[PDB]
Design a protein around this nucleic acid. Sequence first.
RNA 1: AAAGUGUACUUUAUAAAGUCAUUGUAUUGCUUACAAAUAACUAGGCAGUUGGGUCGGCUGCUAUACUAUAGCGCCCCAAGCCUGAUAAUUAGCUAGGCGUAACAGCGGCAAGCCACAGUAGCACAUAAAAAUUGCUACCGUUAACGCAGCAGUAAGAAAGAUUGGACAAUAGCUUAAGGGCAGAUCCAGGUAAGCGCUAAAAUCUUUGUG
Lengths: 55, 119, 123, 171
Amino acid sequence: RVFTSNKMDEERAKRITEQRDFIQARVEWKKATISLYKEWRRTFLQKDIEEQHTK
Amino acid sequence: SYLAQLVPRDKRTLSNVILNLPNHGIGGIFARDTWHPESKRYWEILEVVTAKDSSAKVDAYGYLYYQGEKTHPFPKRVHSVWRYGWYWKPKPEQEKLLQPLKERYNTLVDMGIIDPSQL
Amino acid sequence: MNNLLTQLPKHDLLKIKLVRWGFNKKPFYVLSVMKRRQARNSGNRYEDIGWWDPSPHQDGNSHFGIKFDRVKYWLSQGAVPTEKVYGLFGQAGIIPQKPAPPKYKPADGNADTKWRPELQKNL
Amino acid sequence: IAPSQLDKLEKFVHVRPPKTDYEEDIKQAISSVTDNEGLKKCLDLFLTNHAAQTWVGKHEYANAGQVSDFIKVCEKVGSSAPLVTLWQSAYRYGVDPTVPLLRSSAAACAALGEGADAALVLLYGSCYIVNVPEDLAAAVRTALEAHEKAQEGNAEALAKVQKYREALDRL
RNA sequence: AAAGUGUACUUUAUAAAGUCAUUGUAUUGCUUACAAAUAACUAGGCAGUUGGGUCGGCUGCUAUACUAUAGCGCCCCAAGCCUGAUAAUUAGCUAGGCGUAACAGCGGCAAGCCACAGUAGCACAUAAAAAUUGCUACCGUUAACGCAGCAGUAAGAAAGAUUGGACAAUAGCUUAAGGGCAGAUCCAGGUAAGCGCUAAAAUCUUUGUG
Ligand SMILES: [K+]
Ligand SMILES: [Mg+2]
Ligand SMILES: [Mg+2]
Ligand SMILES: [Mg+2]
Ligand SMILES: [Mg+2]
Ligand SMILES: [Mg+2]
Ligand SMILES: [Mg+2]
Ligand SMILES: [Mg+2]
């Protein structure tokens, strides 16, 4: 669902501004977590390769 | 009257606006009331085809402008025809020519001869 | 008996969830890696990774234990924490805090008594 | 469903096209009409013809030749409401507003004696034509005077005539 | 794939995004072996039965392996296969659990697997799916219904709880406008497992008075 209004008043402006901030914050948060997961993923993969060679 | 399409009205689909205009409003500028007036959001109509059965609904094609710039590469049909709030935006040349006519229409509405809600 | 699962799900998601292991009005939680769609206290797990005691103690703090190495491993594989687990991880500094959406509903005026008829009898 | 792209519209039109030519039906309908109900049917026929032409690709005033015949039938029948509706929505019916058409409609209403209708047609016509002839205005004024004398007994008619006279004077 | 792509959809004088559609290096796996209650007043069992050859065994779109589960099915060919077999009685299995120095014996609680939803045969549904999906016949009440979902009623029995409150918390379904749904669950009521405390006052507890 989305919010739309024919009246160009303060209420309409507030809803648009709040939505923009929430989306921007969430997008930034997603990028940071994924980078951390990718970095950890490489580390564990390397460990498995070393263990396989030893066996 | 076609002059009643300038002011948006409730439950007024784009089909009613397009049909009640000269030449089916080809080459005209239309926008919804929920869009900000200064946002420069509007549709430019290039082709119109009526419904096969109803003959009271229209499928329109054109370009979509946001901030005075095209948003898509090729013409496409208007998918929001069935929504409400559409109104006519005459170009500056049309506005100058229609100055006296708008005054006459407003006077008739003020005196109660013409009821915009019915039309 | 409770052998841990090895094969990953093919049609569902893995999540990090809180399991209720308390007593009457004495909650206690255990964090484990479990399939998204299951019973809350099902015995099917991939690993137990921590515990949490939400109530304050004489020192005024809550206590939380977690495996730092294994949490990273399961987050890398694709396990998705729940909303509350995100809060615990955010405060503990394992991952950045997750922003919450704006709220407009008038909050509940009876949250700790609406669901407890014993108090309402005295009220 | 209509195609999304404009480049595929030609194929859509050619498949099962609707009936477009209604000139023969309208000509027969105009002659056969002798009542107000038939006049309403003709108006619907005009609307269908104006809408149907889009399938072929024409966007001109299809109903530009039979307008005069429709006016003659209305005057003979004695009902002016169909003409009042036509001028109110002239573009929707595919009729190009012009001074000769306005004069013909006003004369027909004046002949019927409905000065109030004559004022309505002139007022609606003034929204399509920038300049209204002064002689036509005088004719409508005479029609209003004749209408007032004919229906002087009805207070509502007197109020309507007075209101229309004020509108004509103001505009 | 916590991904990419779009002549697609929605919101914006504030824009980042999401929605819908589609895409994976072979595009969702079969087989074998061992163990597990009585039982001979059950001694013969099997003929698609044991094995071999051609053909079939579909839902495409890397290349080879000479066709790469199968008597799983048709046709043909050779006579083999099992023999505490075959037929019966009883039981959901694992395990926590209870007695015992142990060995053994028996099977209330948390959880895992399998089967079923009045009875039976079928269609979808393959890969994670039929209490609250269909078709047909039958049984019991009255064209319909089948509470082995929660509460509750009647009969039977020595003996089986309220026709309660709430989504505040945990888990789940849907949704980018921050909401909606819920007899899972959390709380309360009822019933002498068990565990803890009270059933007498004392300078109005000198952890006081000031
Ligand atoms: K059955
Ligand atoms: Mg049994
Ligand atoms: Mg059955
Ligand atoms: Mg199920
Ligand atoms: Mg039953
Ligand atoms: Mg029941
Ligand atoms: Mg939730
Ligand atoms: Mg007793």
